[PDB]
Amino acid sequence: MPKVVGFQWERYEAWRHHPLLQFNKRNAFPGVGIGFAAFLAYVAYDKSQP
Amino acid sequence: TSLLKQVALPVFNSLATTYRSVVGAKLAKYGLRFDDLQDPLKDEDVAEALRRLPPDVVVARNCRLRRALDLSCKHEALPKDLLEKQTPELSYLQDVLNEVRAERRERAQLGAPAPYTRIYYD
Amino acid sequence: SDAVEVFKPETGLTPTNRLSMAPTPYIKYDEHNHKRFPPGTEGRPFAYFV
Amino acid sequence: MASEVVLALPHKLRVMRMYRTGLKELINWSANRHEWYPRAYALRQEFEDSKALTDREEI
Amino acid sequence: GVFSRYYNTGLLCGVAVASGISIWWYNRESIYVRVKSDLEKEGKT
Amino acid sequence: GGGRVEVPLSEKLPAVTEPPRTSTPATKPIVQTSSLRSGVKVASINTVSPISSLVLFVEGGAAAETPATAGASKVLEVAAFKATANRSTFRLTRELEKIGATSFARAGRDHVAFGVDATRLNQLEALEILADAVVNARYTYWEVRDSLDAVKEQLAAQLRNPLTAVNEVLHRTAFEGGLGHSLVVDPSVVDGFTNETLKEYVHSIMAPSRVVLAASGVDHAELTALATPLLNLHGNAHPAPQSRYVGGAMNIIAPTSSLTYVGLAFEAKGGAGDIKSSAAASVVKALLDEARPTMPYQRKEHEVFTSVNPFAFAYKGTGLVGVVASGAPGKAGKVVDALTAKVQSLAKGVTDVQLATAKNMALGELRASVATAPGLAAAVGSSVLATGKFSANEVAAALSGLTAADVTSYVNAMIKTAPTFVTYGNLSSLPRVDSIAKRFA
Amino acid sequence: DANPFLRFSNPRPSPIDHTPLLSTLPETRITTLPNGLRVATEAIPFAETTTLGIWINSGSRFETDANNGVAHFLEHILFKGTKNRSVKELEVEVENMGGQLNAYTGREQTCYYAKVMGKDVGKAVNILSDILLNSNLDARAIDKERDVILREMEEVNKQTSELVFDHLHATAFQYSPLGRTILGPVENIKSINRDQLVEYMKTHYRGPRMVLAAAGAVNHDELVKLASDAFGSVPDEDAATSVRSLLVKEPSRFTGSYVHDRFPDASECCMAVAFKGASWTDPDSIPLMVMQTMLGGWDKNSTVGKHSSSALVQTVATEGLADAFMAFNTNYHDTGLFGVYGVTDRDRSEDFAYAIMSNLTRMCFEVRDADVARAKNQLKASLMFFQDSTHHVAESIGRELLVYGRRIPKAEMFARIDAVDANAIRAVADRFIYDQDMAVASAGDVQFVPDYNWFRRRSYWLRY
Amino acid sequence: PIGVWSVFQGYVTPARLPSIQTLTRVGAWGGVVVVGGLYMVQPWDWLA
Amino acid sequence: RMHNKIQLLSVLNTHLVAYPTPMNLNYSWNGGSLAGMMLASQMLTGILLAMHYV
Amino acid sequence: GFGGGFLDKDSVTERVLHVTKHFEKIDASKVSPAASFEKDLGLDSLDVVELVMALEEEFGLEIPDAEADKIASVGDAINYICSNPMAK
Amino acid sequence: ANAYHRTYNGKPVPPELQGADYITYAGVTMKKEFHLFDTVLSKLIGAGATFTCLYHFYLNAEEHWHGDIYFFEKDVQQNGWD
Ligand code: HEM
Ligand code: HEM
Ligand SMILES: CCCCCCCCCCCC(=O)SCCNC(=O)CCNC(=O)[C@H](O)C(C)(C)COP(=O)(O)O
Ligand SMILES: [Zn+2]
Incomplete structure (x- = not known):
């Protein structure tokens, strides 16, 4: 079952998978953690104890 | 803020010179230099830098230390003819210790520790 | 380094010298107090559970 | 996996018995010989895709 | 796009499961009755 | 998990050599040489290997030592590739270990060599590290003081082999001048060594006309263009004590030597400068190869000898071809007699099969020396430093075009010249020295 | 700062792409x-x-x-x-x-x-x-x-x-x-x-x-x-x-198990500690190669051992624990061996043993990315050095056809090496090292070598 | 010269500091002392 | 290595952890540890009883 | 910059050569300027079409069908590119 | 120019185009770069949206988990009718 025939293209543009050419999950949801922390602090400050 | 940096610069230089003059006048009554105050037991960078010196310099430093300790035990000072020759700001340890500290700073930015430990006597 | 200049053994076919030149894979332990498991027995030991 | 006797067969004989028993099983799973014919042709063709294999590991 | 027979099987199974869920929903007790029963469960704490 | 692909199976398609092959060159690459405007000569040879080797050859070694700076080349072998004006020792070590490169310092009897070996992708880094560690080296006090101990055990271990000691005493006896100085000195010679001694030696040996940059697998135009600002050197050529062959004889007293070693040597006229004389000397070295270990566990038995070890050194203007043979302590005169008989039978003529065998042995040694990139770079650098050119093709042609009559004439001219004779061991049996140097006359 | 002597080179370990070396x-x-x-x-x-x-x-x-x-x-x-x-x-x-x-x-x-x-x-x-x-x-x-x-x-x-x-x-x-x-x-x-x-x-x-x-x-x-x-x-x-x-x-x-070969008047103390490693066909054999490069090796004729990238080499060279040591990775058809062999004397044998055990167990918990990038570059450079000698090329051809069944191309080998990261190193070290039995062998002056229970105790940490 | 002298000299970099995994493994000891105190005192169903 | 940095760790390690002991000691060599444990028990229970005795 | 909308000869040649070597049948040393596709490189019509499409991708070009049919060698393609003001 | 440079033909990658500022893959180099104002503003806006959603939801979670019918019938049964 050979597949390497006629200018295999996967390898030709394999450079497109450059790590900096990829989808970054580090900044996928920016500011979300700070928002969660602020929401937790607001809840504990207003609703929980008083 | 480099403006104010250079600004303290001369106030910092003035206080540094005044402090050095007063302490060196206190230092020269025992024959000590500024570099003689640094202790290998207190500082491992000084302990490593003192290991990098030629042995005659270490002999001279040990002689000055013993002379000062004898003077302190006697509650005396140097004679005036001997006191006039003292130069407490002459450097023998500063470049060696500076290079040791620069090496330790350069190793710490890559995660490496210092290749020397503290001194243990047990 | 050579073992004659470093370990400096006695010369001869003594019992220790035979195992030094060619150790055997059929090691016999003492089994009066503990019987061994079959060799190559895998898995995390049951003594942690005990 | 085959049996130990089949394991002892020559490569040519091993593959021959493999193909023969495969045809036997295809008859055994067949509704009819008439159903078995196209299955036989396909089974013959599949071996034809392996005729020129040389690397004994992949073989 | 993509052709997943797994997606087809999922669609059919979801159809069946949701039909069953609808049947389960059809015979439930009154919301008034449910609330009163829960308040009975809430009155014993 | 991570990769779970079995190595018997091919890994997935993105493990491809999609980057295509560079076309191979039409002919075998030639050595291209030039000179910088500072005067440093640069020679390089292109290879298809993925390893680039850069070596820096400086005239010096034991021939440039003085009684004050005695053993400085051996100290320079250890103290090299340490703190420079631009980098600390830690930074240079980490910069070598980051790209997987290796460094060496190697001191000959008339040169010192410094080299960095790396892959073809890090040739600029290797060149910059090598140039910075050679040109801008600091040689601090504490580092040399701490390296002196390891220098002492390396010399003490290298003097355990009796062939090294015999080679030292043979070079002392054969030459007067630079080549007679001792390379592998006693450990106690460097007991009073300091960094000032090494700095004095380095200041003596360093000069732009005494430095050669040799590279393997590096483009020449790129190498000259990027090494012009790095190898701009200044300095004066310290006078070289030119050596002359005089011959003679000596002795060594060794208290616990279980064997007894005898050295016999002659002068190869012309040195490394003459291609034909060096080729004939290599053929003579191969003709003296009695027990060459061409097969595992083969036991060639000699009546008297325990080991035979010939050599052929080719320095600038003069050489030293000869043979060192061991033997039992009570059979030293027999060792001398057998060595004289072997050289005399060589002078009586070589017979076709021996000539072809020795020519093939010399060709195999010559071609196996330059098989790898560091060996080829070292050969190019040494040949350019000694002569001004690399002539391995001419050396192979000289080896192949050698007749038996030429070799017989060469040995006949050798035995007329006064020889060099060195003994070794707890010498309790020896023929008298006057009759030792009579059998070739 | 020197203009020509300070470009192109810096001690910060970064991954290198060896793809252009594959063209020729x-x-x-x-x-x-x-x-x-x-x-x-x-x-x-x-x-x-x-x-x-x-x-x-x-x-x-x-x-x-x-x-x-x-x-x-x-x-x-x-x-x-x-x-x-x-x-x-x-x-x-x-x-x-x-x-x-x-x-x-x-x-x-x-x-x-x-x-x-x-x-x-x-x-x-x-x-x-x-x-x-x-x-x-x-x-x-x-x-x-x-x-x-x-x-x-x-x-x-x-x-x-x-x-x-x-x-x-x-x-x-x-x-x-x-x-x-x-x-x-x-x-x-x-x-x-x-x-x-x-x-x-x-x-x-x-x-x-x-x-x-x-x-x-x-x-x-x-x-x-x-x-x-x-x-x-x-x-x-x-x-x-x-x-x-x-x-x-x-x-x-x-x-x-444990063995020592004691001699009454020896000078050196050679010792090896190994764990059960990987076979040749295990895909975890490439991370074991990277880990062996991370541990490295050292002998006391070198003087730059205190500036080493490897922490074990740094510890042994700085404290003088051994005259020489080396980490080995032996692979067989259905099993393997991974560990460190070293030469010391009887007064430094326990501290060398502790350094070996502490550096082996440390790879399960803390592995930084700079060490992995450095070891990958060093291993790829070592593979390129074997291509320079035809003897090593022929030896690798013979070995690879005997034990893998095929000639692994250089592109596949570089891709398999480049797929190793710090999480893979932690996983492979957790699989092979952590809380596992080891084999201990020593010979020479071995009266102060610790017994098997000391070695078994130090394959895990009670503080995490 | 252990303490504030280490940070004045520049010896405390982003490197040589504990990692996030190290701090989490040390930070996992917070639950152990809580569970040990609750085991020792046993205030059952005391959470408000 | 960590017990090499503090004296109190070193003394405890030497005299409690890595102290060499004959491998053939039987259960007649347990009287000393038991006597020490009984002294500690007597001291603890006596200190506790002294808070109520007059 | 350079060129009235056109690029240099040299980078075009280098890009064409780099694209060319992406075949299993191809030995690298035989690819050179103005090289025959069929007679020299031994690539079929499907390979020529694939190479045309690949070069179109590399240079971002939409080549007309007749001009593509005219392409039968390395030099022809290079000179065609050397005529394009629309190639990147 | 292009943030990605392409080398082709296995050419030696330019030394000026290597370093921490350049990351290469398949012979093609991309730059590791950071923008201060962009990232700060992105974090601000994302945090604002997240907190908005979280607080609006927490104010109206009962009216979602149970139905309005269920919640208000529960209030009527438990907390009066008027
Ligand atoms: C509070 C009382 C004592 C304590 C805590 C104590 C503790 C110990 C310990 C821990 C040992 C080491 C192991 C052992 O042999 O059990 C030992 C050994 C010894 N003890 Fe005691 N001991 C006590 C009283 C005594 C008394 C009353 C005597 C004798 C009159 C004694 C004589 C010895 C001797 C001779 C040894 C050495 C025996 C040997 O190692 O073979 N001890 N002691
Ligand atoms: C710091 C250590 C100790 C303290 C503070 C202490 C204190 C006391 C006190 C307050 C009592 C009187 C309470 C009572 O009679 O129950 C007592 C009783 C006694 N103690 Fe201790 N004691 C100590 C250690 C010891 C030791 C080492 C011994 C060793 C044999 C010992 C033997 C006794 C005895 C025999 C009695 C009499 C118990 C009775 O018959 O009621 N005590 N102790
Ligand atoms: C969405 C998809 C829709 C359907 C798309 C069409 C799919 C059907 C394809 C199947 C039908 C065919 O292959 S069409 C049949 C094509 N093959 C032939 O005609 C026999 C060979 N004759 C020749 O002249 C040459 O070899 C030739 C190979 C032509 C030229 O190659 P070169 O010039 O190098 O020499
Ligand atoms: Zn054998």
Whole structure:
């Protein structure tokens, strides 16, 4: 079952998978953690104890 | 803020010179230099830098230390003819210790520790 | 380094010298107090559970 | 996996018995010989895709 | 796009499961009755 | 998990050599040489290997030592590739270990060599590290003081082999001048060594006309263009004590030597400068190869000898071809007699099969020396430093075009010249020295 | 800052892409004969020398208790005269082609090879086939080698590292074929003969277990023709007696154990600690290669050991714990060994042992990315250095066809190395090291080496 | 010269500091002392 | 290594952790540890009883 | 910059050569300026079409069908590119 | 120019185009770069949206988990009708 025939293209543009050419999950949801922390602090400050 | 940096610069230089003059006048009554105050037991960078010196310099430093300790035990000072020759700001340890500290700073930015430990006597 | 200049053994076919030149894979332990498991027995030991 | 006797067969004989028993099983799973014919042709063709294999590991 | 027979099987199974869920929903007790029963469960704490 | 692909199976398609092959060159690459405007000569040879080797050859070694700076080349072998004006020792070590490169310092009897070996992708880094560690080296006090101990055990271990000691005493006896100085000195010679001694030696040996940059697998135009600002050197050529062959004889007293070693040597006229004389000397070295270990566990038995070890050194203007043979302590005169008989039978003529065998042995040694990139770079650098050119093709042609009559004439001219004779061991049996140097006359 | 002396280079470890080095690397051609013997060449375009030889998937593992030592005795006997050439005829003919014959016999691999020039390929093929197929195996030469082996056995004439590693294989692989030494016991040498040598060569030196690998200056078609003329008469292999059936029939077993070889007046203290590693075909063998590079090695003739990237090398060099040490990664057909071997004395043996155990267990928890990038670059550079010598190219061709079943391309090897990251290193270290049994072997002045319970306790941390 | 002298000299970099995994493994000891105190005192169903 | 940095760790390690002891000691060599444990028990229970005795 | 909307000869040649070597049948040393596709490189019509499409991708070009049919060698393609003001 | 440079033909990658500022893959180099104002503003807006959603949801979680019918019938049964 050979597949390497006629200018295999996967390898030709394999450079497109450059790590900096990829989808970054580090900044996928920016500011979300700070928002969660602020929401937790607001809840504990207003609703929980008083 | 480099403006104010250079600004303290001369106030910092003035206080540094005044402090050095007063302490060196206190230092020269025992024959000590500024570099003689640094202790290998207190500082491992000084302990490593003192290991990098030629042995005659270490002999001279040990002689000055013993002379000062004898003077302190006697509650005396140097004679005036001997006191006039003292130069407490002459450097023998500063470049060696500076290079040791620069090496330790350069190793710490890559995660490496210092290749020397503290001194243990047990 | 050579073992004659470093370990400096006695010369001869003594019992220790035979195992030094060619150790055997059929090691016999003492089994009066503990019987061994079959060799190559895998898995995390049951003594942690005990 | 085959049996130990089949394991002892020559490569040519091993593959021959493999193909023969495969045809036997295809008859055994067949509704009819008439159903078995196209299955036989396909089974013959599949071996034809392996005729020129040389690397004994992949073989 | 993509052709997943797994997606087809999922669609059919979801159809069946949701039909069953609808049947389960059809015979439930009154919301008034449910609330009163829960308040009975809430009155014993 | 991570990769779970079995190595018997091919890994997935993105493990491809999609980057295509560079076309191979039409002919075998030639050595291209030039000179910088500072005067440093640069020679390089292109290879298809993925390893680039850069070596820096400086005239010096034991021939440039003085009684004050005695053993400085051996100290320079250890103290090299340490703190420079631009980098600390830690930074240079980490910069070598980051790209997987290796460094060496190697001191000959008339040169010192410094080299960095790396892959073809890090040739600029290797060149910059090598140039910075050679040109801008600091040689601090504490580092040399701490390296002196390891220098002492390396010399003490290298003097355990009796062939090294015999080679030292043979070079002392054969030459007067630079080549007679001792390379592998006693450990106690460097007991009073300091960094000032090494700095004095380095200041003596360093000069732009005494430095050669040799590279393997590096483009020449790129190498000259990027090494012009790095190898701009200044300095004066310290006078070289030119050596002359005089011959003679000596002795060594060794208290616990279980064997007894005898050295016999002659002068190869012309040195490394003459291609034909060096080729004939290599053929003579191969003709003296009695027990060459061409097969595992083969036991060639000699009546008297325990080991035979010939050599052929080719320095600038003069050489030293000869043979060192061991033997039992009570059979030293027999060792001398057998060595004289072997050289005399060589002078009586070589017979076709021996000539072809020795020519093939010399060709195999010559071609196996330059098989790898560091060996080829070292050969190019040494040949350019000694002569001004690399002539391995001419050396192979000289080896192949050698007749038996030429070799017989060469040995006949050798035995007329006064020889060099060195003994070794707890010498309790020896023929008298006057009759030792009579059998070739 | 110097302008020309400070560009291009910096001590910050960054990943390097070795893809442009693949454009000019040569290709391997493999041809399988009807005998079952594979002929594999790799032509270097302007090479003048050639390494060529025969690699065999056999050795000390596939012997029995009765003939243990036959394969090692074979390399004493095989070069002492054939049925077509005498000792002197072989010596003259090898001398005239300007090369040397050589032989290695492992636990699972054997090679006989020649390093010649390019004009002597056919002569080397003919000579190698002549020793391999038509040897005399004379009883007088057998008696002439038996006494020499018996003298060197009585003298205990052995390297210290080989002594320690043989003890390590014997105690880690108890009651399995890999626990035997290559040399064999004294009794088998004292009762060896020509019949056992003939039977071993007849059983194991067959077509599907033999690779003729040549590198340097060599044409593939001409080597195919020469191999079909010379090595065409080797017997084929029965399916019931293949290498895989023998591996299944007698499998390897790892046992956590301890041995020391104590001497009354020795100076050094050599010791090795190993864990059960990976086989050759395990995909975790590439991270074990990276981890072995991360541990590294050091000997005290170097003076830059305190500036090493490796933390174990730094600790041993700074505190002076050992005169020399090295980390090893041994791979076999169905098991492996991973660990550190070192040489010390009796006053520094416990601290060296603690440094080994603490650096091995540390890789399960904390691994930084700079160390992994550095080790990947060093391992790829080490692989490129083996491409420079045709002997290593031929050795790798023979080994890769014997143990992987195929020639792994350089692009696949670089891609498999580049897929290793810090999480993979932590996972592989957790699989192989953490809270596992180990094998400990020592020899020499070993009275202060800690026992097995001390080593077993330090394979895990109670603080996490 | 252990303490504030280490940070004045520049010896405390982003490197040589504990990692996030190290701090989490140390930070996992917070639950152990809580569970140990609750085991020792046993205030059952005391959470408001 | 960590017990090499503090004196109190070193003394405790030397005299409690890594102290060499004959391998063939039987259960007649347990009287000392038991006597020490009984002294500690007597001291603890006596200190506790002294808070209520007059 | 350079060129009235056109690029240099040299980078075009280098890009064409780099694209060309992406075939298993191809030995690298035989690819050179103005090289025959069929007679020299031994690539079929499917390979020529694939190479045309690949070069179209590399240079971002939409080549007309007739001009593509005219392409039968390396030099022809290079000179065609050397006529394009629309190639990147 | 292009943030990605392409080398082709296995050419030696330019030394000026290597370093921490350049990351290469398949011979093609991309730059590791950071923008201060962009990232700060992105974090601000994302945090604002997240907190908005979280607080609006927490004010109206009962009216979602149970139905309005269920919640208000529960209030009527438990907390009066008027
Ligand atoms: C509060 C009382 C004592 C304590 C805590 C104590 C503790 C110990 C300990 C821990 C040992 C080491 C191991 C052992 O032999 O059990 C020992 C050994 C010894 N003790 Fe005691 N001991 C006490 C009283 C005594 C008394 C009353 C005597 C004798 C009159 C005594 C004589 C010895 C001797 C001779 C040894 C050494 C025996 C040997 O090692 O073979 N001890 N003691
Ligand atoms: C710091 C250590 C100790 C303290 C503070 C202490 C304190 C006391 C006190 C307050 C009592 C009187 C309470 C009572 O009679 O129950 C008592 C009783 C006694 N103690 Fe201790 N004691 C100590 C250690 C010891 C030791 C080492 C011994 C060793 C034999 C000992 C033997 C006794 C005895 C025999 C009695 C009498 C118990 C009775 O018959 O009621 N005590 N102790
Ligand atoms: C969405 C998809 C829709 C359907 C798309 C069409 C799919 C059907 C394809 C199957 C039908 C065919 O292959 S069409 C049949 C094509 N093959 C032939 O006609 C026989 C060979 N004749 C020749 O002249 C040459 O070899 C030739 C190979 C043509 C030229 O190659 P070169 O010039 O190098 O020499
Ligand atoms: Zn052996």
